């Protein structure tokens, strides 16, 4: 139409001028680049005084090991907070959580009794109303779960056989396309959205998946409804954003709009930025070969972008917060990689992002893991080696496995979970099923003896001394049957609620209509299980009973081979283990029929070329 | 238990003490009545002195067409509004809506947009944070239809073929068991909903109809919670409603109780009050024959309890407000009727209610219709009749017909839809869909003559001077087909939504677990459309057409039978009419699988008895 025109100069056209298709648009007309780090440009007196500025406050953090400050009154939304700076005029990409820099908010959504609890904590007080309307009004995620949770899956997660169930606020290991911003536009992405609902309409009438397809029709209205919002938010910044980002910056500016809209409306853990540099790199190159902007111009407004991804915080209490034990923010950014076609995706902005780790030095939050490939230009590859050793803040994935996996090169990293092509998967975060504790309640009759609580349903202990191996399997085997069921059971629980209290619209919005879900299942305790496993096979394991016959410490008379020595007889007891848990689990039904996965243990045959 | 053991003293065992089985204690120990009004009681100085203060309120409505007063910035609950009396010296029976008596407040959860409406037309504000809480924070029924309905749906809401969809606020056409209260006490009938709520667990961890599994289960969480607010609320009036009712007293306040809490949290149209009259008869009866209370003391309760009964009230718009199209508030009661054993279910009680309407007067609102059959006790036939010429408020409906058609005896009337087997049934009010508007639409092409609009799918309009019968209804009949789609279209997402976002937790807290389902459909103009379709096959009709040739009236020459009058000829059409739609919306899914059923014509293959 209008725009397109005006912003889409110089690009090569294809499908992605059609259709929201972000990855043929990389495919299309991206620069693989070869060269090295010498093109790069240092830091910026702004990027620099900026920096400083928030160091200010991250120092306080540590200091205090406690937020700088949070609200406690206001209940946040993508647009509930007045624009914020660290300095106005200094800054080239804008956008912040709440008004103040590292205010954390809060997103009662989720759970208010959490929120309680981070005020309890860090010694302030919850304004009164905001927990009357999530308690009497809005009903909370956290709610809603423990309203349908069984005893005994409350039971399990006491004892920790099912630990770090997301039933307390944000699950998010959701990655939405944010270049989708930048790329389209909102106005496009929303009548598009508009598109998908109408496409609903023939289903519902006939009946055809009735009630599915009026949740459907609900969210995809509030995917829509959330993307307007989006350009609401945006414009307290002095920015419309219902056209396609036209230079460099707005494509910057737009995308990380995207997710600073995301960021603000929920708290989960591993809300990837996704895959940008290469994506982005086509605008700042375009700008390069035209002389609007400036490489130290380009450099800056990249260390403007990280500068803010390394601000992201949320509100959680001591365990949960990054400082004690707590997940960090995983504001994940994934890097390079080849494409199916053989070209390299590295580009000029893949140094320029690593670069940020000297710049602004070095930093873990904007955790850049690189999809490293064997065939990813050397310049490239010693750069990351180099940066490795000088700030040790990258990280690093195997693009060779991934790529061909998924026979897909626009894929992006979520910790601790599979990856996920890019606005068309959705994955269910399941927490952990820690085996190690099940094979110990297997072998006392589904008790939990340091805690004198039976887990596990009633049956004897392993009766006699040496532990037979054949035996123990078989305990741990039935025993594996009812975790299976328990486990499932919650996770089914969790998401149906997650996704009626506190569906994450402004991510949802960038995805597809009909996304893959999968039910990202985790293990807990593996080595230790598998440890054990050989020992009993592999010595003479004298159990070492008390008054009621409960194994308290085991003797070992002998030697087995440990997790992590690449020997066989474990890591063979180890993939045993995993894949009899995952058969157990997916003979189940999963809520949305999201299919089980894992991402604990990967298998797989690889050829090396020697000489 | 002790609080039984002395409540139940007297009461002859039965079923009815081992579970909620309220039908078998009242055919267990009610003394069915024969005698005559000779018993009855006059008014009391304080019943007459409340009911001269309480109507000077009612004379205020008249006068200024407007609710005496309404709150603009509270949203009711169960227990948001603090005890308010008439006069708390005088009152027997105890529990308004709000602190005032006759002042309407907010229930937010079925639409916010309506609540503005009512403070714009009666000239009021909204508090500002009431509208931000529902509509940012818990979205509201309204809401959540609208932004699942489709443009045609729309259309035919704007057209009027589908019309009177509760779409904007309370569907209501619910029937909670409220004597439970009262028979069981609070506390059991809590811990019997956490029997339920556990009975679910089997399916839950087996997946056997998974989503449903759990969606039963939060509904039965929420009936759990609802039922511990209503002690609380009840608390606030001095009273204890743990335990079950005693005498007379708290038998009939305890069951008010229950009925309060229904019409403080939702704002239906047809929220029977249910068959109460005989049950309380049982506790009345019981405190008479031994002393503890007066005839003329019990009159004075059943005055104050219909009193209250009288004063429910709901804030609507002028539109909707009782005079206009406005439906009243149908606190129906349903007396007298027989047992399936032959027995009368004619009290003393019975009596008693018809008297309030010369106690208090004749008041339209505590709508009484009498359970009629051909057996009722004489002198009780007699006295309806006497009441209705003296009162002209009593209302009918044939006991001869419902009973043996349920064979049941316990069932209540619900105004404009099927009866219901008092907690056992669950009716989804559908609006009525017009068929004498679908049969002009489908003359005119689908076109709506008066709104010029395209409603239905285009066709061309019938051609000819002269209309046949055979194919106007040719016609019809593609054309109600569409219509029904449509239709039940709306109904499924409608009653979805009003499931998730204003259940009625405290009525549905006193059903069984698994209650039956009905789409309560209805139909409007089929007279209209009968006498029309009649015209056309007994009279030469000739159209008057418009520009674009669609009929805009109609030249009948000659006689043609009218409905009514037993001419077969026309009532026929009318049946035929009738269940070619029916058939039509019952080879469709319908939401929660709720079978479609209809009350505006029943048929009855009747046998009399002569001599």
């Known amino acids: 139409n209008e725009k397109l025109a005006t912003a889409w100069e110089g690009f090569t056209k294809g499908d992605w001028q059609n259709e929201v298709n972000v990855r043929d648009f990389i495919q299309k007309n991206y620069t693989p680049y070869e ?14 005084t900026l920096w400083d500025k928030v160091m200010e406050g991250v120092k306080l953090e540590n200091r205090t090991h406690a937020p700088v400050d949070f609200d406690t009154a206001v209940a946040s939304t993508i647009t509930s907070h007045d624009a914020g700076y660290i300095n106005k005029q200094l800054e080239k990409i804008v956008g912040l959580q709440t008004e103040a820099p590292l205010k954390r908010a809060l997103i009662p959504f989720g759970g208010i009794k959490m929120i309680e609890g981070s005020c309890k904590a860090y010694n302030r007080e919850l304004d009164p109303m905001i927990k009357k309307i999530f308690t009497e009004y ?15 899956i409350l039971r399990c997660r006491k004892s920790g056989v099912l630990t770090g169930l997301p039933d307390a606020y944000g699950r998010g290991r959701i990655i939405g396309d944010y270049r989708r911003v930048a790329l389209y536009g909102i106005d496009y992405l929303m009548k598009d959205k508009l598109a998908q609902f109408t496409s609903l309409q023939a289903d519902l009438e006939n009946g055809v998946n009735l009630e599915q397809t009026i949740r459907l029709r609900e969210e995809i209205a509030e995917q829509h409804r959330a993307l307007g919002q989006m ?19 707005e494509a910057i ?15 989960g853990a591993a809300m990837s930025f996704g895959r940008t540099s290469t994506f982005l790199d086509v605008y700042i190159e375009r700008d390069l070969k035209a002389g609007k902007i400036t490489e130290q111009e380009a450099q800056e407004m990249v260390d403007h972008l990280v500068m803010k991804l390394r601000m992201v915080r949320f509100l959680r209490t001591p365990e949960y917060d990054e400082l004690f034990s707590g997940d960090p ?25 690593l670069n940020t780790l000297y710049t602004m030095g070095p930093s873990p939050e904007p955790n850049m893991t690189i999809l490293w490939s064997e065939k990813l230009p050397l310049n490239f590859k010693k750069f990351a080696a180099k940066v490795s050793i000088d700030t040790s803040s990258l990280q690093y994935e195997n693009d060779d496995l991934m790529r061909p996996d998924f026979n897909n090169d626009d894929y992006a990293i979520a910790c601790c979970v599979s990856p ?52 123990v399997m078989e305990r741990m085997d039935h025993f594996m049957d009812w975790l299976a069921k328990q486990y499932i059971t919650a996770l089914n629980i969790i998401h149906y609620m997650h996704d009626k209290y506190s569906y994450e619209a402004s991510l949802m919005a960038l995805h597809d209509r009909d996304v893959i879900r999968t039910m990202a299942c985790g293990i807990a305790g593996l080595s230790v299980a598998a440890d054990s496993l050989s020992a009993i096979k592999y010595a003479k394991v004298k159990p070492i009973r008390d008054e009621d016959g409960l194994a308290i410490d085991f003797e070992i008379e002998g030697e087995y081979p440990q997790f992590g020595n690449n020997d066989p007889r474990v890591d063979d007891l180890a993939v045993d283990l995993v894949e009899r848990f995952m058969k157990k689990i997916q003979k189940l039904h999963t809520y949305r029929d999201a299919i089980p996965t894992q991402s604990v243990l990967t298998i797989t045959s690889n050829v090396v070329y020697g000489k």
Do not use: C
């Open 329 to 353: 923010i995983w504001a994940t950014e994934s890097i390079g990689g080849m494409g199916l076609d053989g070209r390299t995706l590295v580009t000029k902005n893949s140094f320029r992002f």
């Open 35 to 48: 060269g090295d780090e010498s093109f790069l440009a240092g830091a910026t007196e702004a990027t620099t």
């Open 420 to 471: 996920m092509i890019v606005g068309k998967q959705m994955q269910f975060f399941g927490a952990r099923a820690n085996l190690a504790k099940t094979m110990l309640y297997a072998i006392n009759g589904g008790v939990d003896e340091k805690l004198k609580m039976q887990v596990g349903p009633k049956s004897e202990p392993i009766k006699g001394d040496v532990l037979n191996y054949d035996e």
């Open 231 to 249: 350009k609401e938010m945006a414009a307290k910044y002095g920015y419309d954003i219902s056209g396609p980002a036209t230079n460099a910056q």
């Open 138 to 152: 809005r009903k909370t995620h956290n709610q809603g779960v423990f309203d349908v949770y069984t005893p005994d």
């Open 253 to 267: 500016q737009w995308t990380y709009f995207g997710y600073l809209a995301a960021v603000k409306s929920q708290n």
